[PDB]
Amino acid sequence: GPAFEFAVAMMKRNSSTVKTEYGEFTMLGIYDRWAVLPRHAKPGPTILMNDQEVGVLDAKELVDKDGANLELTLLKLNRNEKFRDIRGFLAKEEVEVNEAVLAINTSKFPNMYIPVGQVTEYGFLYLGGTPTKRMLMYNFPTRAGQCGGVLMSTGKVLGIHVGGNGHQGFSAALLKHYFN
Amino acid sequence: GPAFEFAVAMMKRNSSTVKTEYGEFTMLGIYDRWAVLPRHAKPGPTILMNDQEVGVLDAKELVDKDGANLELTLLKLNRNEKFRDIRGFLAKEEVEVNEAVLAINTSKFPNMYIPVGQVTEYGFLYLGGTPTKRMLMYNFPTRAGQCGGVLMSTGKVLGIHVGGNGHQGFSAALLKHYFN
Ligand SMILES: *[C@@H](CC(=O)OCC)[C@H](C[C@@H]1CCNC1=O)NC(=O)[C@H](Cc1ccccc1)NC(=O)[C@H](CC(=O)OC(C)(C)C)NC(=O)OCc1ccccc1
Numbered sequence: 598g599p600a601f602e603f604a605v606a607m608m609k610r611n612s613s614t615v616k617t618e619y620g621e622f623t624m625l626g627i628y629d630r631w632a633v634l635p636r637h638a639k640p641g642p643t644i645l646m647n648d649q650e651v652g653v654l655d656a657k658e659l660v661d662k663d664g665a666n667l668e669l670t671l672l673k674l675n676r677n678e679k680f681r682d683i684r685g686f687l688a689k690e691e692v693e694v695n696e697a698v699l700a701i702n703t704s705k706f707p708n709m710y711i712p713v714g715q716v717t718e719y720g721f722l723y724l725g726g727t728p729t730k731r732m733l734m735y736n737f738p739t740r741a742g743q744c745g746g747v748l749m750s751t752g753k754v755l756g757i758h759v760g761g762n763g764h765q766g767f768s769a770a771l772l773k774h775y776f777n
Numbered sequence: 778g779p780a781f782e783f784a785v786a787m788m789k790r791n792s793s794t795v796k797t798e799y800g801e802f803t804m805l806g807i808y809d810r811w812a813v814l815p816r817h818a819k820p821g822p823t824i825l826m827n828d829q830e831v832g833v834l835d836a837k838e839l840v841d842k843d844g845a846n847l848e849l850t851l852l853k854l855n856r857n858e859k860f861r862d863i864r865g866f867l868a869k870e871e872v873e874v875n876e877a878v879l880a881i882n883t884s885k886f887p888n889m890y891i892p893v894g895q896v897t898e899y900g901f902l903y904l905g906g907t908p909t910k911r912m913l914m915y916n917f918p919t920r921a922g923q924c925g926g927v928l929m930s931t932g933k934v935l936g937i938h939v940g941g942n943g944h945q946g947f948s949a950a951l952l953k954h955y956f957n
């Protein structure tokens with residue numbers, strides 16, 4: 598009920614559709630000129646953001662202390678406009694919930710809102726052959742074109758959707774401390 | 778973009794969650810006290826509508842001239858409140874579109890909005906062993922609990938989701954002339 602409304606306001610104000618040479622993704626802007634994509638989107642020095650080319654000034658593929666893949670890329674956009682700062686809405690650690698929304702917004706799947714149910718701390722996953730950490734698992738989404746989707750509960754952004762197999766979907770935890 | 782917004786306003790104002798002895802469904806109220814469910818929901822003399830028992834005064838399983846199943850049940854509710862009249866938003870015939878939204882709202886899948894893509898006039902289908910007519914086909918939804926979902930484009934209600942197999946989903950066309 599409310600999760601949906603929180604999710605619409607977030608996507609309206611902070612999401613965009615991105616095309617890289619590797620596909621189409623939902624992208625979430627975080628603050629200033631910093632946004633987040635799944636690592637596998639591999640953004641280059643320019644991306645198409647809502648149909649417009651936008652320069653990327655820097656791109657950081659996140660890894661943990663020991664260098665384990667976190668499957669997220671932080672990108673700094675070469676644009677004058679700043680994002681509305683949503684760092685306050687970010688989870689401080691991996692979050693488990695009984696109900697969450699996955700929000701996806703691309704030209705192929707516009708304005709898609711999926712109630713994904715129980716979200717659990719899956720932890721380590723061999724995702725597309727790559728050892729990955731801080732995975733959140735949920736049942737029931739799981740097609741190409743949905744990566745970058747934003748996983749949310751009321752008033753919190755939990756993760757960014759990165760992978761899946763069968764009826765299972767996986768988000769990279771989107772943690773407050775990643776930003777700065 | 779707009780299809781989503783039209784879809785939210787419709788669901789907000791005219792949809793409800795229904796439980797019959799046969800499951801949980803999205804239900805759309807049409808006008809007066811008349812609402813629509815998939816035929817297979819088989820509503821009895823009482824249904825649970827948004828958590829409250831509500832009497833059903835009459836239930837008509839629709840069939841065409843020759844008695845072919847249309848897979849829709851019209852129900853008249855024993856309640857004082859009238860539905861907002863949306864007969865004007867109903868398609869007059871089977872509609873094919875390149876993009877449509879499927880909106881599903883139950884306790885298990887709350888506030889679910891799915892862009893389903895190309896919607897074509899499939900026509901006759903052997904659905905769950907029953908010969909059925911006036912089917913609209915689209916790719917990509919297709920789980921238990923989603924029947925009754927409302928298929929829409931901007932400013933039009935096209936159908937009610939009734940069945941599926943694999944990545945294919947099927948709506949019964951929701952035609953203006955069924956109401957009266
Ligand atoms: C989003 C990005 C995308 O579409 O890229 C291709 C254009 C996509 C979403 C998943 C596809 C299936 N379900 C989804 O939700 N992500 C990926 O494809 C992701 C890319 C990736 C991520 C990390 C490192 C490398 C690559 N890969 C996966 O999700 C893979 C999918 C896969 O290879 O399997 C099939 C394509 C389904 C055959 N999933 C995976 O490796 O899971 C292993 C596994 C097995 C059993 C249980 C859990 C997980």
Ligand SMILES: *[C@@H](CC(=O)OCC)[C@H](C[C@@H]1CCNC1=O)NC(=O)[C@H](Cc1ccccc1)NC(=O)[C@H](CC(=O)OC(C)(C)C)NC(=O)OCc1ccccc1
Nearest residue numbers: 800817904905906907919920921922923924939940941942
């Ligand atoms: C919604 C109602 C429901 O959940 O009832 C059970 C509690 C549900 C939605 C579909 C399930 C799979 N995908 C869906 O979108 N509807 C049905 O289950 C529907 C009930 C029905 C409708 C009409 C007459 C009798 C019964 N049945 C179907 O969709 C059947 C599903 C089925 O039996 O197959 C599996 C369960 C998937 C194994 N679909 C069907 O008969 O399709 C035949 C077909 C084959 C190849 C191409 C197209 C269609």
